[PDB]
Amino acid sequence: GMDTSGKQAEAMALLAEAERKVKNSQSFFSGLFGGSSKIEEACEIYARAANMFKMAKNWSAAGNAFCQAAQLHLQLQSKHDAATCFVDAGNAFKKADPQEAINCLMRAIEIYTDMGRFTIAAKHHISIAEIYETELVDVEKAIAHYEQSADYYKGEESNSSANKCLLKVAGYAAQLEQYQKAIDIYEQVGTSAMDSPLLKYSAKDYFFKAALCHFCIDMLNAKLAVQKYEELFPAFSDSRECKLMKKLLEAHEEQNVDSYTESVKEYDSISRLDQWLTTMLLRIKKT
Template sequence: MPAKSPAQTLLEKADKRASSSAGWFSSASTKFEEAGDLYQQAANSFKIEKLFKEAGDAFAREAECREQCKEENEAANAWWNASKAYKRGFPDLAIQALTQTIVHLTKGGRFRQAADREKEIGQIYLQESNDLRKACESYERAGEWYSQEDATATANACFKDAADLHAELGEYPQAISRYEQVADHSLTSALTKYSVKEYWLRSSLCALAMGDSVTARRNMTKYSNQDVSFASTREAKFVNALIEAVEGGDVEAFTAAVFEFDQITKLDNWKTAILLKIKKEIDDDGRLT
């Protein structure tokens, strides 16, 4: 029989302590405190051995011991440590552990940290399971919490990510209202004002993807009123050229406008995908209303 690893030995000690009776002289909370410390040591030992699932499981057991002792902060921390171990190949378990972390953080009124963890959940949904819907919900929730804590820049980054995902899901009205929300916030500061044209460009592309050039035009007028310098930007000229091409059912003019814009400002994957969708609409209809 192979010798037990140090981590395995610690884990067995922790299990034994957790299930022991409290005894005459110690309270139940002392028992769970000691077991929690042993689980934590076992988890760190598993990490050294690169056994991440076992490490995550041990941190989760530690978290449960901390909960027995009503130690909210320690429990939140243990669940977070569990999620970090689970992230190495077990995304579903990482999300469960982060969800538990958030329960403790929100109970303690620590919404800023809760938002950080919620954003992590969004990233896991996006990168590991390509679940755009759930990722979008997590980014929006994180954004709301950041807003409550006056972390406006971080909130805006989350809302912008959510808007991109709404658009990818074909939910253009939701995407437009998120882009406009982020743009409105960005207008209030000299530092972020420069990024407004990017949000308005994305919003306008969403309107065209809906096949609604009337809304696209109306929004362009609204944006130019909100910021007088917008009309002269390359982004605004690009959108206006696209609106003309779409309304004229002119695929060549559309393609030329896209090519010209891309020469100076490389189109990212998101814009490329939505522009292809708009072009396909012109191809199909020959004309859009």
């Protein structure tokens, strides 16, 4: 803790002698023009001092050391090392101050994309989106990052990751009352899952959500939509989702609050309802 802090001070001295190496580059490298390996080992000692700071729990200092090492190392060579240093700096910045982590991760995104490795690019896009969501309140940037990551994943035929990202995007859009995109995504994911034998059980839930979203926009067209879903999937009426939706819509034909209240309480009597469904029902049934 404190002796490790003494060695962290020694690492600050290591950064000071790295500045001495920069002074060498400035003045003495004229006679040491061939000392490129000297710059390489300067970057190495930079990284070691940054690791020492990381052990010292000096997150800001470790991140600054990582950023300096990344900037010095990206001398138009060893691009992957610079990108790795930038993502390490972002990870160090994940806690404490993550704002600059966003910019560093964007630079790493640009570099990795320049290489063309779409998997890591989409992974970092999801990372920045989730840190945005859990730290900042802006959602439009998060939804754009989710869209870009899902497109990248779908480009390489990675259907599952793109489908889950699009499901989250549809849920967020429904929260932001953009129901056309939500219903489109839910229908697409349901029809895709139903096609394979391994993903036929989940379909019901998706349909439910889609139906609800549709029932939010047009009440009359809700009957046509539910009939279309029923005929598309003969085994959709049996499940409790279709029965409950039918009960709700047939009760809404007459202005009787008691019916829908009892129905929702009974459905909740068998399992707890999440925040999304509870809020959606409360908002929609108000009128």
